[PDB]
Design a protein around this nucleic acid. Structure first.
Lengths: 64, 78, 49
RNA sequence: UACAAGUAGUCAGAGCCCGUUAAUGGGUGAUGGCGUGCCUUUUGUAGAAUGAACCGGCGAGUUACGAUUUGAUGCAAGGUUAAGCAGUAAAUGUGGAGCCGUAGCGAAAGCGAGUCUGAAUAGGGCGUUUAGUAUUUGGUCGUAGACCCGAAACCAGGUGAU
RNA sequence: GAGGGUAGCGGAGAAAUUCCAAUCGAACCUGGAGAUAGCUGGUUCUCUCCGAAAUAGCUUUAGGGCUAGCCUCAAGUGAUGAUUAUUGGAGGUAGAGCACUGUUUGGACGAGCGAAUUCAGACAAACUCCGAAUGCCAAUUAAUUUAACUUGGGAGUCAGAACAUGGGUGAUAAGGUCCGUGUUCGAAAGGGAAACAGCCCAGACCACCAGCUAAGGUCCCAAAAU
RNA sequence: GACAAUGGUAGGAGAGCGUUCUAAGGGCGUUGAAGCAUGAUCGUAAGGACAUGUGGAGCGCUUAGAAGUGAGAAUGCCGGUG
RNA sequence: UAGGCCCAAGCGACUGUUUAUCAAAAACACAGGUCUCUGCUAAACCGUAAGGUGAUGUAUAGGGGCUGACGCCUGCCCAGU
RNA sequence: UCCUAAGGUAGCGAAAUUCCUUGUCGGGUAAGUUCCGACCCGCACGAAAGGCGUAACGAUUUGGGCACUGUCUCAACGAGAGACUCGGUGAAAUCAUAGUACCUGUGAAGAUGCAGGUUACCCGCGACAGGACGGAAAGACCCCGUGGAGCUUUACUGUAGCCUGAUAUUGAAAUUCGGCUUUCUAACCCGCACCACUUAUCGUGGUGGGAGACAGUGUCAGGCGGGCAGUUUGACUGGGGCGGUCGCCUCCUAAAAGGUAACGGAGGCGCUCAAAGGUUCCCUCAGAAUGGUUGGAAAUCAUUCAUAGAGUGUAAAGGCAUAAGGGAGCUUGACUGCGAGACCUACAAGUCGAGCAGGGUCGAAAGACGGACUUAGUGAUCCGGUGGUUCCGCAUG
């Protein structure tokens, strides 16, 4: 049968035009009184999956 | 029959980051330190935690500033 | 599997939602209209055939 | 071959008996030099660590559907059909629902070679780098017992007081 | 003695975890079933080229796994690699010293007189007025050399050992144990050290009854000076 | 005709030998096929020929295709014999 | 063919029973004692339905716990469970 | 003189119980760690998981005697069955190939096989048992597996069963400061009696008696419930337990860049401050060889020595008198939207930052200000709560 997509991973990344994956940031749910203003402001920006983590979850997102 | 010691903190990578006579950019870190063991010079700024960084592009120069005191400066290349 | 350490997807949070009334269109740039006759009438029924 | 201390062979070498796919021939071996089997597992084994009495036969990475990468081949801003129907269980002809590509960006409304964030193309992020697609050989991965042999146990339905 | 009854999530027990068809802390047979095994064992023809690791971080983790680091095969971008000479810099070890913080020997001077006065002599990983040899970062500087980097396909490795040297620990004990640095073994035959993976010399493509050398040697075993 | 390379475990890469079957082409066999036994033969290796005896009916070669394709170890399974 | 005996201690009263196949005993049982539950379609027990045992019995009876002939005795605490 | 619900009575006592211990003192022996009789310093006896005695019984444990004897001093001889020699018949465990010596040494640290020596002609039979780490059983002790099974409980989550309410089956009458209770027959119940099926009382039916809207039964709810069931119960560690430890900050070990171990040597943190923040102007400390309203030389005041020996919210180490230390005035930048380029780094994270636009505070003005001299005071995501809003919201609003 066909491979199944990791539904948990499909809710946290998107495919760019060049084959990269965009993700969200961590430390953003709660406890904002313990973090600085600059620390919280710069965490609102998105990032891409690192080149080392892609080698481990390539097939997990082969249909996205 | 036990030990009371065994604690320590992670090591910070302090010291110089660029060499004398080397070319750097406007925002290159030059020296990480606790306090002011080396003072800023021409076209150099001191960060919040005493980090020394440049402000223009040029060569680095470690020179002496008074008896038993050192500084770091940056001069544009011509 | 990471051998016991938390996986990257568990560490990251979810984002966004999906719209049920998503409308998509077939784009046709001004470059693909250089084959028809001068002054001709172009209609979707023709572009699809 | 009965004065001799030998993982039994190898190199050197008299004597004695033979004569071949015909060539720098065949068998035997007085005496001298050198030399503590094989496999598995280990930092390290002649090991007194494991396994095999001997001979023969049998005895362990395979296949079907998906994904990815490389080689080959046809066509090319296009490439290609699935079920079905007619045919020798031929593998051809028909069949264009469907799938990928030609355009991205945003959670979304949406806009568009630009878009998102923002009071502000001020700056920054991801795109305008943009050739593709079908079949197939090889490598690896996924779902199936998944390279082969081996448990102490668990559950279900039955058979037993000679 | 004969004929009968009680059956496994159960019976029987004057009670021993005792018996239920020669092994009962839970009988036997068939099926789910090729249960599961991060653990042992095994895994079949031949040549050619290249060639490791026994480390770090996290881990219901420690004889398992994942990413990074070292190997190999392709497609790419071009001196961006390495050694040396020279000119520059950052950094307080060895040694030394008593100017600071301590510890501490012998005298001299009356503020209550051996250590917050003075004249001499010593000590320190957590003392420093001073301070090397090396190593490290640079200068598209010079000469000799041959790498380096990026993208993609496939791996293995996470039990290490001895010797020299700088240290902790132990007792300036251990073929002990834990870190820094180099070499060898591991995966390396050949010669020497009588025998002897780690020591010394030296890296086997094949053949020869040719020559010169290294470590170590030249009375005999035993090649070379009684 | 010149200089330079070629120890090697875990692993990566490349070129090959042999076995059974299939499709085409071209060939042997009662004037003796396969198998078996013996020998002093050829190639860099896995391997390939030839002669003789035994045997008594099938079997090679060339190119390509497809695999139940290679055994010394598992206290391995079965048979035979020390 | 057919009992050695005697002077003193520990344990259990006694005959009896037990680990088929390494333990026969001081272990189990026993007569006796005491506590407690049960007024009859009894309690308790099996099935946990019908139907049965108890029992064709009726508190001088039946089920359960702990002691264990006999003799002399068996003290204090009810905060906790 | 403290505390407790009460502080062990009779009896017994180095005991099937006494660790010190072969306790001490008397018996038995020429010699007694055992045995018997007494002493109470009872680690840790004690009255129905009974205490102290007891005739008769025991293939029970224990000490001392008589008799007897090859148990022994100390062995000898004789009889029979195997062994041994011939005829018949004829297995088994074991086994990498074997022409299989000793000594000292060497080696994975205990050699028939390696080094140097010593000794030894070839091949049988009857005996001994030292070694081939001899042969029968994938070591039962020990440690490991996020392996099993049996048992226990005030480990977690369930359940048979039992108890208690609401409601259906289920209808009357009256008392009564949308009702628990006396009350009546008609549902329902009776291992109660007499009759018929039928010369069997299992069952059905009929007539009496008893009981009665209770009981029994279905659904829902609360409580008790190792009786029974499924499972969990960490790692590091000079073996494992027990003890200690687990994240973050500073110093030494660390071998003058950075990095670097041990159950190696020393401490600290899980905050605080509305001024202890920003800005502008001023200022400067300990200790003070002496004078004094003379108070066990040091509170307060006065003049000179004063290389910082003072301070710096809080550990330590680097810094600070061009102040980062003290005081005095106004203030909220402890701002919004970002951000070239760098440090660190497996990942996720962490750190510094010129500069640009929008607001502002302080200062005459340059100019400074995106908390605190610097480095600890902290924890993914998933789920839920509270606000704001461009957005979506299943045919349409």
């Amino acid at each position: 049968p066909k491979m199944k997509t990791h539904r948990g991973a499909a809710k946290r990344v998107k495919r760019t035009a060049s084959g990269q994956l965009k993700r969200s940031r961590a430390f953003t749910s709660h406890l904002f009184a313990n973090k600085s203003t600059k620390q919280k402001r710069q965490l609102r920006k998105a990032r891409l999956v690192s080149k080392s983590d892609m080698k481990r979850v390539k097939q997990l997102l082969a249909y996205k | 029959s036990s030990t009371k010691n065994g604690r320590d903190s992670e090591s910070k990578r302090l010291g110089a980051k660029r060499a004398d006579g080397q070319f750097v950019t406007g925002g290159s870190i030059l020296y990480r330190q606790r306090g002011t063991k080396i003072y800023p010079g021409e076209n150099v700024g001191r960060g919040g935690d005493d980090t020394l960084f440049a402000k223009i592009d040029g060569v680095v120069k470690f020179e002496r500033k008074g008896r038993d005191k050192k500084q770091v400066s940056v001069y544009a290349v011509a | 599997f990471e051998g016991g350490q938390l996986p990257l997807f568990r560490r990251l949070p979810k984002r966004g939602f999906t719209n049920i009334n998503r409308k998509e269109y077939a784009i046709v740039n001004l470059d693909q209209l250089n084959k028809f006759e001068d002054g001709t009438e172009v209609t979707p029924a023709l572009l699809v055939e």
